[PDB]
Copies of this chain bind each other. A is one copy, B any other.
Amino acid sequence: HLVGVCYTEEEAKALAEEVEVQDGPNEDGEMFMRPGKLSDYFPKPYPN
């Protein structure tokens, strides 16, 4: 929601990559980490 408001799309794809999030399950393993993919709501400060 910031592209066109505060930053260009680069400066925002690269700003999502500052933090790595937990995405869903998978084969060939589990709980795999992933950086921001721009479809990412702002990270939670607490688990619960």
Contacts and interface: CB of A to CB of B under 8 A. Distances in A.
A8 interface: no
Q: Which secondary structure dominates where chain A touches chain B?
A: loop
A25 interface: yes
Nearest to A26: B48
Contacts of A47: 25-27
Interface residues of A, number: 7
Interface of A: 25-27, 30-31, 47-48
A27 B46 CA distance: 10
A28 to B, nearest CB: 10
A-B pairs, top 8 by smallest CB distance, nearest first, are A25-B48, A27-B48, A26-B48, A25-B47, A27-B47, A30-B31, A26-B47, A31-B31
